[PDB]
Design a protein around this ligand. Structure first.
Ligand code: SF4
Ligand SMILES: [Zn+2]
Ligand SMILES: [Zn+2]
Lengths: 434, 481, 444
């Protein structure tokens, strides 16, 4: 691992523990998802985006400038993690395109971090040749470079380094007559250099992913990696952490105000439907009950709450006991986990059990058409510009980012300060805002 | 060709998922799509639209609609129960009753068990909504459980019949078979013998001798003429009615074998103590856990027992620390017995030795290679791995349509070893509590270098077993080859 | 005191119990380390020079191992017997048709004469199973997991009726060379633990064994495990005050230091009952660090099962009580007409493996990939060492001389160990000339 940036074209051949394998895979998936969401919400160049991604990389300890720690741990972690994700994502074309996009964003960011003085060696360490021109040569050919330069305004040839590259590597660049050539070697600025670098890296990644897709059948035989790699991105949550077992003081009467103040749209509308109809289907009942368990509702409180709501349903309380108290206690209690023991997550709500007629469960953004989204948002009293940007984000299939923006709107803040992946995290952050 | 077929099939699956639908099964020859629609015409037009869009994406692919199910219970490939929707004229349809793979192989079931299974299947294949079906099934199961528990049920329904392939004395496992036991009893005590090809009738009974159920099998008239012993209701609820119903109800979402046991009687405790935890796991979960926590990871792992040398009192080591809040004390600091003043930390050697034995035993238990059939009705428990094989795993010699799988999975043993190393992983356990001043005070008050060395030795006693532990480490060279 | 009081008060001290070969003088002795002594592990890809790889099993791979074993034995038997061609098990054939497959017990219990099924190979019968009826068969000897060719008649396709069994053919012996015949007579000691009584830790039997080793000065001494039995009540109750590894190291160092003066070569064969070592079959060689140059030259640690050659004589070493396990689940037409041990040894030699029984006994763990690649017979051994709980014996079956010395200590009573001279005879003459000359199983 000579350099921090690196091109991933040499698979590792070490041995690692299974726990390390899983940790690396999960960490890199979290990093990529964070990169995607951060690029979607912000602009790719603003200092805010760079600082936030710096913080994410520091917390995930994936890369850093050269030092004792960087030599050993972050660089190997990055290498093996990238190749594990290669195994995970080569299954489908959509996954390949998504992986390529986010890896390109990460590489561009890391390149921007990299100080200029080292770029040369990186280009040398990349195993393909790019040569930097001398100051005397730059002074001599400044007029030629400016004349051949793109629509870049003025004759100012600033401190940006200029490099000598074969015309073959700048096909798409010099084909438009927007660069200077000399003896078959082209002189290019930094921005176009990084463009070329990312283009070649994309070609290499596409070829490698195709090869791994072909090679998958040999490696899919393993049974202790199938359940992890099959659904590494599709259906794995990035450390939701809002599991069963939380503590708090929730008053049953207050629930209503909480519902209109600190609930995510899914749970907000589920609660409204419950209150208005005094009944829920199986899926919505399970989802909302699990959410209430997550926020801090104790078993007796939950039983009393559901029983009190069902008395208004005009059905025998003893029937309620014998029928549903068993289910509620089982949900709050013993084995059968991962479907009843654990509160749902935004990813599970979106990707599992789409609602049907007469069913009010599911994420509203994903499961309700834009007209009804606008109706609901109006009923929630959100500014028209907020609604427009929410709809724009939904059209971009960034449902969780849309919910984040909705959080910011209702809480009357600018930045929520996190990345929601679990409704209970929504409620916890809202309560933290009080 | 196979690679391209798989690629296009996966693309079609993801596309139809994007269409706000959900696909429940398909292998290169069929695709079951759940429409979430109760209107037949809507379903037909939706099928036409998906066919048209896939056709315009792939010009030469000629897809078509083969059949429609009003309601379907899916369990496996060619294992389901459905109401085939045969479309009649004027848009009306007939719900033909169809079901494949529900056949039962063994005929050793009580008449009451057969009646309960018939009721459950009929209810599930009724057209009423899911909630109504579940409510009816739960009500019937509770009623049956109460009726059996209180003895209201006729005894004649508890009778069991089983054929005899060989002479009663020639069965190698005669101890575990109730019917051959009754055959031997009738041959010895009675007159006319029982030969191969005859059917023997028996009913399980409670003798109070704390024996296995197979040993207590008694003839029906023998039970009727004897009063010292009665019918074993618990056995019938546990492995004569629970199997039949749970074979069908378990797949339904929101209902679990534990829940069925709770409905049926007072089994839940002893049931989950005596329950199979194999089919419950299913990676189908769409975005649930990432890596769990130690509490739910080592829940199934057996706790580390140890006898205190001084007093002999049992000690359980299920975590590095014991107590609540301020008194977060190491489990080895004091003996579990309040009267004993001997700190287990003195007897580390014995501890380590015992640990070895424990892990040793587990390894042997893993290598016994006990295979169990997955169909709850059969649950054949063999050890001779059959050469005959199926798509998923070994084929059950009894159920020519089923799949054996290990009783003690390899990953269960790996989790057990990891739990053993975690019990003594003092350093890592010192990084799980947030309050730093608590860590400082606690470690300065108990975690001296000597006890740290002892804990490290205990870790190593299992880490040396884990190092050679069967792909507990993954080799990248093979993976990326 | 009372512990091991019997050993201090046993009258049979040093009295030979059985003899085989030619009459030999009671003063058994060798030349010690002097002279050219060859001691080389042999065959079967080196039989676990290293420690191991895994304790992780895959059902498809175990299936591949099993079917490969069946098919290899089948090809060998077919080429030897000039069998026309095998037929699928499930094919209903009116005329008698040869069928290939491994025997198995129908249920989970002890095999019965009419509770037997035949499981075929994939390339012929797709691994199908079929019950077999032995009523018509006259003479047979079967056990679970043995590969057989049965020429019964199966007119229905659902149940075969046996009509003749093909005695399996053993591997060819080890072809010697001029150097092998160039070896003078050498005496071999063989003993099998446990080396302490059921209620002692003093290891008095080990001290007596060391004394006899020093006095006799044998050429090579084979010591089987366990060295601290896992079934020992002392360790089963974890009353020991020292780690298992420390106690094993102490015992090994005592053995090594005791026989320094003898100059006898020493080899240690692990056993599944060894508490400290890995509890999996096959077992890699023991691990020891404190070895000098002379000690390293005089002591060898070998795997188990191992097939080592001493002075060009193939030794078949196996510490697991294979005889007992096979006898537990072996059926035959006649019991008293022939000796049980003879036919069990016949099966061991014929099946070409150091543990042909399948599925093994409950108190045994077999890793089938390593077993397949490390626990196959390379050649019919000249001498077979199988210390078993059964009574000591020395048989000569199919040329190979199989010796069961017996456990060195039974409960609290004394045990026995086997001495045996070994001299490769004239290069030519009689077609079969067993290098073994005389064998004496003698009480300790
Ligand atoms: S993004 Fe998550 S919290 Fe927000 S509405 Fe959807 S499921 Fe609920
Ligand atoms: Zn005590
Ligand atoms: Zn079965």
């Amino acid at each position: 691992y000579p350099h921090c940036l690196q091109f991933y074209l040499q698979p590792p051949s070490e041995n690692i523990s299974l726990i390390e394998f899983e940790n690396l895979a999960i960490d890199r998936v979290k990093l990529l998802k964070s990169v995607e969401n951060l690029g979607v919400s912000y602009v790719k160049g603003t200092e805010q985006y760079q600082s936030k991604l710096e913080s994410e990389l520091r917390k995930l300890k994936f890369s850093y400038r050269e030092n004792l720690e960087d030599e050993y741990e972050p660089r190997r972690r990055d290498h093996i993690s990238h190749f594990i994700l290669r195994l995970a994502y080569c299954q489908s074309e959509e996954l390949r395109r998504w992986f390529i996009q986010q890896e390109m964003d990460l590489l561009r960011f890391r390149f921007s971090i990299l100080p200029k003085d080292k770029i040369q060696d990186f280009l040398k360490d990349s195993q393909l040749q790019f040569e930097a021109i001398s100051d005397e040569e730059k002074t001599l050919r400044e007029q030629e470079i400016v004349a051949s330069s793109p629509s870049l305004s003025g004759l100012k040839l600033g401190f940006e380094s200029i490099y000598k590259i074969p015309f073959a590597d700048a096909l798409d660049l010099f084909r438009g007559r927007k660069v200077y050539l000399e003896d078959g070697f082209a002189y290019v600025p930094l921005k176009d250099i990084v463009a070329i670098i990312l283009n070649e890296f994309r070609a290499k990644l596409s070829k490698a992913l195709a090869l791994t897709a072909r090679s998958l059948p040999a490696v899919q035989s393993d049974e202790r990696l199938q359940p992890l790699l099959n659904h590494l991105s599709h259906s794995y949550t990035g450390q939701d952490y809002s599991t069963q077992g939380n503590v708090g003081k929730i008053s049953l009467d207050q629930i209503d105000l909480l519902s209109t103040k600190s609930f995510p749209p899914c749970m907000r509308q589920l609660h409204k439907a419950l209150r208005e109809n005094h009944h829920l289907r199986h899926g919505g009942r399970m989802q909302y009950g699990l959410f209430l368990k997550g926020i801090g509702l104790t078993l007796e409180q939950a039983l009393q709450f559901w029983k009190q709501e069902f008395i208004k349903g005009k059905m025998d309380p003893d029937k309620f006991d014998k029928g549903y108290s068993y289910n509620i206690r089982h949900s709050f209690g013993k084995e059968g986990k991962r479907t009843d023991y654990t509160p749902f997550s935004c990813l599970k709500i979106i990707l599992s059990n789409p609602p049907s007629q007469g069913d009010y469960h599911g994420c509203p953004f994903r499961h309700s058409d834009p007209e009804l989204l606008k109706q609901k948002l109006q009923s929630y009293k959100i500014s028209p510009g907020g609604i427009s940007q929410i709809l724009d984000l939904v059209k971009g299939t960034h449902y969780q980012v849309a919910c984040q923006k909705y959080f910011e709107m209702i809480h009357n803040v600018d930045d929520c300060g996190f990345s929601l992946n679990h409704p209970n995290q929504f409620f916890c952050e809202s309560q933290r805002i009080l | 060709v196979t690679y391209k077929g798989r690629e296009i099939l996966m693309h079609t699956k993801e596309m139809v998922q994007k269409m706000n639908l959900e696909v429940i099964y398909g292998d290169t020859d069929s695709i079951m799509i759940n429409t979430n629609s109760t209107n037949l015409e809507e379903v037909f037009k939706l099928g036409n639209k998906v066919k048209s869009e896939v056709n315009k994406l792939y010009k030469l692919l000629e897809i078509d609609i083969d059949g429609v199910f009003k309601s379907l219970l899916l369990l496996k490939k060619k294992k389901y129960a459905a109401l085939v929707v045969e479309p009649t004229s004027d848009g009306n349809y007939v719900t033909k009753q169809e079901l494949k793979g529900l056949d039962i192989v063994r005929r050793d079931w009580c008449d009451l068990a057969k009646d309960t299974g018939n009721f459950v299947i009929g209810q599930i294949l009724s057209d009423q909504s899911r909630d109504t079906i579940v409510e009816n099934i739960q009500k019937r199961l509770i009623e049956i459980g109460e009726n059996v528990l209180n003895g209201s049920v006729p005894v004649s329904q508890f009778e069991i019949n089983k054929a005899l392939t060989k002479d009663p004395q020639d069965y190698p496992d005669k101890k575990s078979l109730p019917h051959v036991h009754v055959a031997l009893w009738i041959n010895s005590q009675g007159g006319r013998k029982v030969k191969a090809g005859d059917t023997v009738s028996y009913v399980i009974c409670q003798d109070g001798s704390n024996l296995t159920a197979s040993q207590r099998a008694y003839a029906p008239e023998q039970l009727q003429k004897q009063d010292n012993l009665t019918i074993d209701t618990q056995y019938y609820l546990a492995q004569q009615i629970h199997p039949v119903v749970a074979r069908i109800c378990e797949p339904i979402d929101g209902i679990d074998a534990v829940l069925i046991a709770t409905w049926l009687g007072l089994d839940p405790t002893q049931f989950r103590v005596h329950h199979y935890h194999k089919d419950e796991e299913n990676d189908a979960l769409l975005g649930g856990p990432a890596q769990l926590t130690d509490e739910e990871k080592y829940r199934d792992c057996e706790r580390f027992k140890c006898p205190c040398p001084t007093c002999g009192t049992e000690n359980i080591y299920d975590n590095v620390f014991d107590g609540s809040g301020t008194d977060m004390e190491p489990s080895l600091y004091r003996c579990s017995n309040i009267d004993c003043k001997a700190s287990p930390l003195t007897f580390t050697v014995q501890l380590s030795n015992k640990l070895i034995m424990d892990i040793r035993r587990f390894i042997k238990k893993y290598y016994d290679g006990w295979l169990i059939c997955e169909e709850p009705t059969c649950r054949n428990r063999t050890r001779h791995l059959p050469l005959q094989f199926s798509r998923t795993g070994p084929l059950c010699p009894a159920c020519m349509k089923a799949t054996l799988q290990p009783e003690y999975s390899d990953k269960s043993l790996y989790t057990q070893l990891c739990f053993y190393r975690y019990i003594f992983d003092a350093e890592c356990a010192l990084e799980k509590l947030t309050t730093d001043h608590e860590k400082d005070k606690l470690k300065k008050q108990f975690f001296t270098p000597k006890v740290l060395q002892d804990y490290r030795k205990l870790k190593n006693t299992a880490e040396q077993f884990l190092s050679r532990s069967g792909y507990s480490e993954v080799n990248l060279s093979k993976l990326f080859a | 005191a009372t512990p091991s009081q019997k050993y201090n008060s046993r009258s049979n001290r040093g009295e030979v119990v059985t003899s085989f070969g030619l009459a030999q003088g009671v003063s058994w002795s060798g030349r010690g380390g002097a002279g050219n002594i060859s001691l080389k592990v042999l065959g079967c890809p080196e039989a676990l020079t290293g420690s191991y790889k895994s304790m992780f099993q895959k059902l498809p791979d175990i299936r591949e191992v099993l079917t490969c074993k069946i098919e290899e034995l089948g090809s060998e038997l077919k080429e030897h017997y000039k069998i026309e061609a095998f037929t699928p098990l499930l094919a209903p054939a009116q005329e008698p048709v040869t069928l290939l497959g491994q025997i198995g017990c129908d249920s989970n219990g002890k095999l019965n004469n009419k509770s037997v099924i035949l499981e075929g190979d994939r390339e012929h019968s797709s691994g199908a199973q079929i019950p077999v009826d032995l009523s018509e068969l006259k003479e047979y000897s079967l056990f679970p997991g043995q590969v057989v060719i049965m020429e019964g008649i199966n007119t229905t396709g659902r149940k075969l009726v046996a009509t003749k069994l093909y005695e399996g053919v053993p591997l060819p012996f080890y072809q010697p060379t001029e150097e092998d015949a160039d070896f003078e007579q050498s005496m071999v000691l063989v003993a099998c633990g446990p080396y302490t009584t059921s209620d002692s830790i003093t290891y008095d039997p080990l001290l007596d064994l060391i004394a006899v080793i020093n006095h006799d000065r044998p050429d090579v001494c084979i010591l089987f495990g366990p060295f601290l039995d896992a079934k020992h009540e002392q360790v089963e109750n974890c009353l020991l005050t020292s780690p298992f590894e420390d106690i094993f190291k102490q015992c090994l160092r005592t053995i090594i230091e005791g026989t320094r003066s003898s100059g006898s070569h020493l080899v240690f064969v692990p056993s599944l009952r060894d508490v400290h070592h890995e509890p999996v079959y096959p077992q890699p060689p023991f691990s020891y660090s404190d070895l000098s140059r002379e000690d390293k030259k005089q002591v060898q640690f070998v795997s188990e099962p191992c097939s080592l050659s001493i002075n060009g004589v193939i030794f078949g070493l196996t510490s697991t009580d294979l005889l007992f396990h096979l006898g537990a689940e072996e059926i035959s037409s006649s019991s008293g007409t022939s000796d049980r041990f003879s036919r069990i040894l016949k099966h061991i030699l014929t099946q070409r493996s150091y543990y042909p029984l399948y599925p093994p006994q409950e108190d045994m763990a077999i890793d089938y990939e390593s077993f397949y690649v490390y626990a196959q017979l390379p050649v019919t051994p000249d001498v077979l060492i199988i210390p078993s709980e059964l009574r000591y014996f020395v048989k000569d079956v199919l040329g190979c001389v199989c010796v069961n010395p017996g456990r060195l200590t039974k409960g609290q009573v004394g045990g026995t160990f086997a001495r045996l001279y070994l001299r490769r005879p004239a290069a030519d003459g009689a077609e079969r000339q067993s290098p073994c000359i005389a064998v004496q199983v003698v009480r300790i």
